[PDB]
Every structure is written in C-alpha cells, then in structure tokens.
C-alpha cells in the first residue's frame, strides 16, 4: 500500500511517526515498532517524528514507558505540531536529542476528561484526576527542567510555544536549520 510502503521504508531506516490523535490503537503500533526496532539493533538510535494534536494519557504513557525502557536512544522531532501528549512525548525524548522543526508549534496544557456516575463513583474519578494531574506535571517538570509550580501555572490553560520559545522552556534541545 503506497503510504504503508513509504512508512515501511522509513521504518527500516529506524524512523517512526506519531502523526495523529493518540489512541490505544496508535500507541500500540508505536510501542510495537519501538520493541521491534530495539530487538533488531539495540545500539542504534530511533527517530520519532511527532505531528499530533494530543490524545489519551493512558495510551501516551504506554508509548512513554516503552521509550524509557528501550535500550537504544530515542530522538524526537517536533514537526508541524506537538500538542498535549504530543508535546509530552516530544519532551520525553532522550536528552540532547530532542528537536523542533523551525515552524513547529508546541502546546502544553492540563488534562481534560469527563465525570459520569454516582456521587461515589465521581468522588473516585476525581481522586484519580488529582493523582494524574500531579504526575503529568511532575514529569513535564522533569523533562523541561522547570519547577513544578511553573508547569502547573502555565499548564492551567492552553499554553503555546514557537520552536524558539520551546527551546528556552526546555521541551526541546535543538532547532533544526539549513
């Protein structure tokens, strides 16, 4: 399949794409690809191109953990847009090898979700939000080098970064040019 074939050929060059909304489905494929590439050559870098509007945290953490546990380094390229989980994963790239393309946009914000059931059920959901909010912030703080308080504050509502700004905030190590 022409698109599949094109990605395939890139895949064999150790280049993977996160080009869409982050689902369980997309996550699983990515996680499989990182597993497969590590198992092939455990020494060479993997390049993760990211152009995603964000998505499922659960699904995003699958990718993140898979990244972290990989033996080889994982280089991350922000192309076009790296939003929300997309930003998180971009910033989770191995330090020194996180790149932004010059006109890419990065979007950091706090989690969204929903609340459903009995008051008891909701009490539980809420409790979990706390846990998650906290943890996601803790990690972005770690990635960026910013203090958790600034991550909390800045993440309160949509926070946009140009490649330039993203570099100075610490989402990214370099900006690519030529």
């Amino acid at each position: 399949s022409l698109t599949d074939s094109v990605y395939e050929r890139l895949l064999s060059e150790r280049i993977i794409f996160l080009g869409s909304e982050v689902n369980d489905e997309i996550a699983n494929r990515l996680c499989a690809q990182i597993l497969l590439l590590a198992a092939e050559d455990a020494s060479k870098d993997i390049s993760l191109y990211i152009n995603s509007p964000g998505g499922s945290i659960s699904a995003g953490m699958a990718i993140y953990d898979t990244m972290v546990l990989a033996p080889c380094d994982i280089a991350t390229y922000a192309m076009g847009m790296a939003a929300s989980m997309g930003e998180f994963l971009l910033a989770a790239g191995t330090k020194g090898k996180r790149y932004a393309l010059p006109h890419a946009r990065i979007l950091m914000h706090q989690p969204l979700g929903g609340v459903t059931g009995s008051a008891a059920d909701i009490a539980i959901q809420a409790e979990q939000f706390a846990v998650i909010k906290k943890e996601m912030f803790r990690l972005n703080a770690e990635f960026t080098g910013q203090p958790i308080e600034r991550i909390e504050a800045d993440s309160d509502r949509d926070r946009w970064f140009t490649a330039a700004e993203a570099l100075e905030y610490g989402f990214v190590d370099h900006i690519i040019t030529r």
């Binding site: 706090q110 989690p111 969204l112 979700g113 609340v115 909701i122 959901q125 809420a126 939000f129």
Partner: protein, 200 residues
C-alpha cells in the same frame, strides 16, 4: 384525556378540572419528574397557596420517580419556608428526590398509601460532564457537597444520623410504606376508608 366538570352553588356556577378542584382544596400534585420547569410550578403553587391563606394547611400529593437536585432543594426550602403546615402524601412512588420531599413534610403529617414505595439513593449524574480537570475538580467538589446536603436534610427529618443515611444510600434503598415509616420518612400509613369494608 382528562375530564372537566361543573360545580353548582347559590353564588354561581364554575367549571374545573380534577387538578384544579384538587388545588382549590390546597392540594398540590407532584406527579412528573422534578425537572427545573416543574419545580418552579410547584414553588409558585406553594407560594400562592400561602399568600391566599397562610394559616390553613397545604397538602402535597406525591407520585414521582424523582428529579434534579438543584430543584429538590429549592422546593424543599419553599416547603419549609411558607407559614402554613405541609402535609405530604405518597400515593404511588416517591423516589430519589421525591423521597426527601415526602420526608420533608411537617412532622406528624407525612403519609403513604399501603402499597406505596419509597426509594432513596445518592445523587447520580447520567450523561457526562466534560471539561478540564480544574473544572471537573470544582464540579466533583460541588457534587460531594450536594450529596452530603441530601444526607444532612434527610437526617434532620428522619431523626437518623447523617453518616447512617450515607451508608444506607450508598446503593439504592427501597422501602415499603411500613418500612418507610420505621425509617422515619413518613409518620403514618393510610388505611383504606372504604364505607363497605368499614364492617371490620
């Protein structure tokens, strides 16, 4: 289909419904689901009846599957607020919110027909509230408040401990008229007044 009829008198001749004849006798009918619309209609009726004669009793006929919490409280506040005593009478079912209302009649004056059914349960939200976590946390908080306020106000009227209510309502709790009386939600269970079986 709901008939109307006419009433003779030496003063004049008037047309009315059953619901109007009921209201003429200070009986307010709570039969739908307690949506924001219906609640206003109930409050207005209560307020008007008070304005028309503050000393005489208001009776509230209840056969309702329940309804909105925000509405429940408004109705409740109005029930308690008016000068007149409130008599609550469960005819079929008083579920959810309707249960609290039933319970919230003036003491001594809370009733149910024998095969009536009272159901209490904690506040649910069917359908989803979507949002940023910050918004949701606020929401959740407000819901815990709403929950504990239901438990407080039932406790007040049943004579039970708030914490006990919470335990008993964590899941759905269904009560026969008798059980409801025991629980302290109604005072008496109405016995049938049929003139024919009066020979017993």
């Amino acid at each position: 289909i709901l008939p109307s009829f006419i009433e003779h008198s030496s003063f004049g001749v008037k047309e009315s419904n059953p619901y109007n004849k009921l209201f003429e006798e200070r009986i307010i009918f709570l039969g739908v689901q307690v949506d924001d619309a219906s609640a206003n209609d109930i409050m207005a009726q209560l307020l008007v009846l008070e304005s028309l004669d503050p000393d005489r009793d208001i009776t509230m006929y209840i056969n309702s599957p329940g309804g909105g919490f925000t509405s429940l409280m408004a109705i409740y506040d109005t029930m308690q607020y008016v000068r007149a005593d409130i008599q609550t009478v469960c005819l079929g079912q008083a579920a959810s919110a309707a249960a609290v209302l039933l319970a919230a009649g003036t003491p001594g004056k809370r009733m149910a027909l024998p095969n009536a059914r009272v159901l209490i349960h904690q506040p649910s939200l069917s359908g989803v509230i979507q949002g940023q976590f910050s918004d949701l946390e606020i929401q959740a908080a407000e819901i815990e408040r709403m929950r504990t306020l239901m438990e407080t106000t039932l406790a007040r009227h049943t004579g039970k401990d708030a914490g006990v209510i919470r335990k008993d309502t964590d899941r759905d709790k269904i009560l026969t008229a008798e059980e409801a009386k025991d629980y302290g939600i109604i005072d008496t269970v109405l016995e049938y007044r049929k003139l024919s079986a009066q020979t017993a």
